[PDB]
């Protein structure tokens, strides 16, 4: 199949995924609200801009802007992953109150 999966890498992936989910909702909140909120979470601004760059980025994997290629791969896994036993998604998809 390939190399072995690293549990440390998995944790960083789901951390970036959670940050991307926040930034998106952090923006959709302002997209409906209207006013520009000053979010205090570290890197939220960064991932907001990553998202905005990625929606019109054409370089794909080769891209240079940090977190663009990794975010595209991560969000793509998020959408296509249906498994109930996935080590990356399970804490997120099955979060709840």
């Amino acid at each position: 199949t390939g190399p072995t999966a690293d549990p440390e890498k998995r944790k960083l992936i789901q951390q970036q995924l959670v940050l991307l989910l926040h930034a998106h909702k952090c923006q959709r909140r302002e997209q409906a609200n209207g006013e520009v909120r000053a979010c205090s979470l570290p890197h939220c601004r960064t991932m907001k801009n990553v998202l905005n760059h990625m929606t019109h980025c054409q370089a794909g994997k080769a891209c240079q802007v940090a977190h663009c290629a990794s975010s595209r791969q991560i969000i793509s896994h998020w959408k296509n992953c249906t498994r109930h036993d996935c080590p990356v998604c399970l804490p997120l998809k099955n979060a709840s109150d």
Binding site: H67, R72, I74, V88, P91
Partner: protein, 58 residues
């Protein structure tokens, strides 16, 4: 009830230490391909697909 709830997300944010002032690890494409694989390279989301994917929580 397909969209993720904000209150839970904030709990995740804090429970993962993402509110702490730290540096953001720069993950390589290759590492994500291994630990977060997709059926094939034709399934790399682009454009509006990206935003739509972050709305759902299958």
């Amino acid at each position: 009830t397909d969209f993720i709830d904000e209150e839970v997300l904030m709990s995740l944010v804090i429970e993962m230490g993402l509110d702490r002032i730290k540096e953001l690890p720069e993950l390589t494409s290759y590492d994500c391909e291994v630990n977060a694989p997709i059926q094939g390279s034709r399934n790399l989301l682009q454009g509006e697909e990206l935003l739509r994917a972050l709305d759902q929580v299958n």
